[model samples]
Target: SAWEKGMEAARALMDKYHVDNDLKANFKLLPDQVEALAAVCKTWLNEEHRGLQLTFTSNKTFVTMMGRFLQAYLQSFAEVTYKHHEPTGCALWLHRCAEIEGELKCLHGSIMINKEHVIENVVQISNTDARCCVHDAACPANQFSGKSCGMFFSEGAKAQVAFKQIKAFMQALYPNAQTGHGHLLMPLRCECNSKPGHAPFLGRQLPKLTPFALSNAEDLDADLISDKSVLASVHHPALIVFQCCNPGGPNCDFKISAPDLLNALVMVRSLWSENFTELPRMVVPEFKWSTKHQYRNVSLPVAHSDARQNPFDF
Candidate 1:
């Protein structure tokens, strides 16, 4: 009955939006998220690609943000039962996208919410009673834990430990190039990437980002869809921060959902691989590939997709 009640509550939220079939079916994911997630997801879906973590910023307070997460979490757990893996898995995987039921299914793993510090993050604090190894482990950022993955949330750029690390990781991954003199050709930029070979070495120009259809997916009042420049500063291919454009008052401007988080991340895991660049990005399926292909989200704007068709607003 609690889960049933959870479903009813989700229906009530969907009732607030004038959601239709087109892009709205993608849970009306904001433009920046789609931009960042699609690009990040591209690298994630491939097994050859290492795991990833996302950090979200919103103007709302932690109390309101957490409530919405709770709401979304309950609803998502009820919506994608196949992902549950066990009767108790739903609660266990709350805000967690990997290692559910002791198997790291799609991504690598963990979600930290409104946390001011990393070790203090992960819903745990200096504990001796947990079941994992690395006892007396002060920080999850330590070698024993940094690889864990999942989407993260913060109080609107307020600062989150997990997210702070992703930027440094990306910086090291995508480094600047060194230039050298080439008499035959013109002076050339020397490529000195760490791993080399298709690993974004030599400062190769990245592909122009593909974005979600804002006309079909944006909330005109809440999202700054036209201000693409606002996103320009993030620079790194792996990060995007959404700001609150809410002029109405104290409210959660960035409307996000757990089911959407899971759906998008799954695509991030299932839609990418090592040879991705050899093809035209996600050429066959394009940006529309999804974790919930042709499944159900019927009335709600959740993962109701048909991979045979591209999922974005191309």
Candidate 2:
């Protein structure tokens, strides 16, 4: 009820400031997405407010979340300035909030979609039959047809083309993954990220290797548990699955084997630091949110949760 009350309060404020009407008419959002935006605003206001008072961190957090929400909405459709430009009273705070929200949204949207945008270039270049290397040769079918030796090559050139594109992709994705000597570094054992809300943190750090748990439902082999490379690469907060079942058993559906869906269970393990001889080292990005915003990497020490919690400390 408190959350709903907070949301109602936010809605009231929006209506009083004409934001609700303006957003409905001018803001570029699908019907369903507009609903989702309303939900986001409600939840944000609810979480940021305590009883009837806004919390200390609520303003900036609200701004950032709204920024992302509006950013996504705007990117999907045409942009227009809010109908009312001049603000006399609270509209100033609310309208400025919307504009700043859009600004932040634009920056984060670029960061979030950078991978896809870069992949577009890769896809475009890949579509062209440009000669990638000196060993380029025409396709066998073209050669047979006596067509102009359309620039191309066998598996080698194809492999090189894909490899070069992937090389570029990885360089963009994690340029730090390389060593000073120009050799690529082995990826560290990644911890499982089970919380879906941590989507914001994805790509901010090295990706998790696998789901924290595995199950017989997926037909995964238990022998994989002892595989040295797999075990060594097991993330500290990872999951391993185990189950027992028989095909056409009473517990299983006859149309498909029971093992395929029903008879499986999962357990989570948090092995912070026990089995491994050494922890994998990483060039973690660190941020100073309190003072000036700066990020750098250096070998650092960890305490109880400094290992898992701090995004900047790796």
Candidate 3:
């Protein structure tokens, strides 16, 4: 039973990150798993760690895997963390639309294809930071003492308002979703007052929390204005964008490779960063998305074709 006690405690830390890859045999019946976990934590808390920023530059999965383990190890108390070569990402969901069909039969294909549905920002959960985590020092400014518009509560308070808040935000932000025209960013991260141990933490679904547009006057820009909005953790928060046409649909016709486009998007900004624009004009046309256009650092409305025409379609 003592063995079970020790194993149960350490099992969470070990199995989730695949630590069993090493000591499965050594700890089969060992009753000192608590010590084992302590040792792992000791190794994790070295000087190189304990920082707001830690970047591991490697092209191999070995380091990548290890970085992930460390990230999970420190998530509850550490605030921010992540590894590189991350695949999950944010996307500009675009849909195709045609305006005036009566204007063309001589050129049905040449009448010009304009996008209709709103270009949605879809942030994947894998890498989105749970900036609001209150279990440790992760929350922005730690100013939640009744000042967060009631958003600064713990995950264990029998309060899952955050998840509802997130979904409602999505519902409000993507009002067009009723007609299938908007995409809302719903990424996963720890809740402010997390209960303890393992994500899906308490098996409750909590999306990464962020400051809303014009939500609470007192809380409005306080978080963003403070350097607190900027993550002080080492996690990379990696996520890639998905290309869409009409559906961006799970299986749609995309002219560009999704990952390739996402890779390019990263050099500019990840979808999770600040000052996201939700205007339809900016989002609907795949060309107008900030990251897509900035891929070359070239900002010219002249590329709009309607704005300026070279006739060569170049």
Error of 2 at 293 (Å): 12
Name every residue pair that clashes in candidate 2: 137-152, 212-239, 213-239, 214-241, 286-312
- The alpha-carbon lDDT assigned to residue 277 of candidate 3 equals 29
Steric clash count of candidate 2: 5
Candidate 3 vs. true structure, TM-score: 0.18
Model 2 scores a C-alpha lDDT of 0.24
TM-score of each: 0.17, 0.15, 0.18
| Residue-by-residue lDDT tens digits, candidate 3, 1-314 | 54454345345545542453556346532211223333333333332234312222111211222322222222312222233211122223321211222121000112221112222358632312222322213223322211111122222111122223323333443455545432223211111211223221111122222222222332323334323212211011221221221111122222222222222223112111221222111121122222211111112344443654455564
lDDT of 1 at 19: 26
In candidate 2, stretches whose alpha carbon ends up further than 4 angstroms from where it belongs are: 1-19, 29-44, 47-61, 69-314
Which lDDT tens digits does candidate 1 get at residues 63-168?
2322223333433434533231211111211112121332211111222322232343256533222221121133233112322221222221212211222333
Off by over 4 Å in 3: 1-11, 16-77, 81-88, 91-182, 186-314
Q: Score each candidate by Cα lDDT.
A: 0.25, 0.24, 0.26
Sort by lDDT, best first: 3, 1, 2
- Residues 1-314, candidate 2, lDDT per residue (tens digit)? 33343244334434543454655444332222333344434443455443432211233323322333332223222222222221100000010111221111111112101111113223453323222111112222212112111112222223232223223323443457643211211111111211222232211122111112222232344444744323321311122111111112122111211111111000000010121233222111121112111111122355564545546744
Q: Report model 2's TM-score to 2 decimal places.
A: 0.15
